[PDB]
Design a protein around this ligand. Sequence first.
Ligand SMILES: CCCCc1nc(C)c(Cc2nc(C(C)(C)C)no2)c(=O)n1Cc1ccc(-c2ccccc2-c2noc(=O)[nH]2)cc1
Lengths: 254, 11
Amino acid sequence: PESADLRALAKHLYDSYIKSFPLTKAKARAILTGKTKSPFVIYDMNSLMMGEKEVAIRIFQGCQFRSVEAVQEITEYAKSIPGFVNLDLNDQVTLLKYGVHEIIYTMLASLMNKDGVLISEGQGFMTREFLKSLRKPFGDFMEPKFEFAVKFNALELDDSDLAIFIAVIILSGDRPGLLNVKPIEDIQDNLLQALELQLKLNHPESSQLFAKLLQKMTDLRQIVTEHVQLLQVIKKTETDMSLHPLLQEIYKDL
Amino acid sequence: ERHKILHRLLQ
Ligand SMILES: CCCCc1nc(C)c(Cc2nc(C(C)(C)C)no2)c(=O)n1Cc1ccc(-c2ccccc2-c2noc(=O)[nH]2)cc1
């Protein structure tokens, strides 16, 4: 291992992260803290109608479009991680299949404070209470994300940090179905090393930021798991629930 | 394989 390469990798990943995800933590936080006329607050059924077939199904059918596009962008990110393009195309699929939603919820955290979540690329703000007030099991989709986002946002990671942490999540050599995990671990071990260095310089006063961040990686796996389970309860009930084929492609056998 | 959209998104 060489510090120059590890730092080259950090900077490489950051520039590629900038060039791949139009929505960064820096833009989301600038909106959330008012330093950026202003997002439209959605806190009830009526101002949801003013914000612009049941309401709960409708609040979430629109999000699919951004999910699909996040799958597109995460994929253009994974193609920039040194070594990924040469892995067996089958492992490339599996790494995106399991990685994509862990990274989405990592990025969704930037959009969240304890009180709510930015919507429509920050043109709206939908309150947590309102999401909590929805019916069926619909009003339990977002509350686990808020509890995570509050704890995760407390790490004070920035877009430099996130680029590498997200790359580490993609290069997870323990997902079901990888063909040979050996080259995946060599990439990730090295990514983990850039992270440790990255966090040690960017945050010299957060003693064990590295350990606390590794433990959030497992939190992200449980969020996806519960989320996938809630989807199963809906598919048994809501006839009005359809899913984009890319998302349906990802959720099957997950 | 059976993820054909993702397969296509990669090349
Ligand atoms: C209305 C609340 C807004 C929260 C939200 N906003 C968006 C924009 C996305 C997608 C997405 N954000 C991003 C970035 C910007 C890069 C972070 N990139 O992408 C997102 O995920 N969430 C969480 C969420 C949870 C639950 C269901 C849901 C609820 C009930 C039934 C089905 C589903 C569902 N439909 O498809 C799924 O996977 N679950 C949908 C979505």
